[PDB]
Amino acid sequence: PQITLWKRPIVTIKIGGQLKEALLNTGADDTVLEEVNLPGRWKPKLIGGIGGFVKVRQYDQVPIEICGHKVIGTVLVGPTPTNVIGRNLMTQIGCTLNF
Amino acid sequence: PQITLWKRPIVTIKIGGQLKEALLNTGADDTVLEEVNLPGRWKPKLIGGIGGFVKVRQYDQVPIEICGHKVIGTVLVGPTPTNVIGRNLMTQIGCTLNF
Ligand SMILES: CCC[C@@]1(CCc2ccccc2)CC(O)=C([C@H](CC)c2cccc(NS(=O)(=O)c3ccc(C(F)(F)F)cn3)c2)C(=O)O1
């Protein structure tokens, strides 16, 4: 689809058997979620944002279906305000900016 | 143009007679810059980010030319991991997401 930017570009995702909403964020290198329950090993990561730095769990090779498109990649889990889909996943669904 | 997301979507801007680079950020409601020297009155604002909250100066009706497109809108000035162009300005240049 084409999505305009008069409102937040929020989409429905399925991850780890759970349904969430998340923001398509071209400013984010990475994908950051909260309150998801991912299986298996992870490693600590620190990421920077507006407001400071955040400690997250880094989970690799995680299946996630984003607006009906199945992809796999790294998902960070930690205490973000809104769920964010970053460029690491947006490239996998073929998303571009256009003006 | 069309811009893919394999790298950060960075564009050149002119604001207040100075040249900067900034990140096209569909996750950001607002536009946040640093090191800009804007004229005249401003109001304090607090904004939330993934890592906490930031105190910024809010300047209204600021001319800014973003990749050669002249627009006007609110610009927030304060700390950020990088200069960010948010949806408030991206709608004015007719930017959309497409997948
Ligand atoms: C003004 C934008 C503020 C924003 C708003 C988040 C939000 C939205 C709705 C409701 C509440 C909160 C959006 C955003 O992209 C980030 C930053 C980048 C500016 C962000 C988002 C996601 C992850 C990261 N960390 S990172 O390691 O992937 C990373 C670090 C730095 C940058 C850089 F390009 F900005 F430098 C991009 N990515 C940062 C942020 O900190 O919060």
Deposited resolution, Å: 1.2
Q: How many angstroms separate the CA of residue A80 from the nearest CA in chain B? A: 5
Q: Where are the domains of chain B?
A: 1-99
Cross-chain Cβ contact B26/A9 below 8 Å: yes
Cα–Cα dist B9/B1, whole Å: 12
Cα–Cα dist A20/A35, whole Å: 9
- Of A79, A78, A77, A97, the C-alpha closest to A87 is A97
For ligand 1, whether the C-beta of B67 sits within 6 Å is: no
Residues of B in contact with A65 (CB under 8 A): none
Pocket test for ligand 1, best of B23, B25, B50 (most atoms within 8 A of CB): B50
- Of A34, A59, A63, A33, the C-alpha closest to A45 is A59
Pick the CATH number of B1-99 from 3.40.30.10, 2.40.70.10, 3.40.190.10, 1.10.1040.50: 2.40.70.10
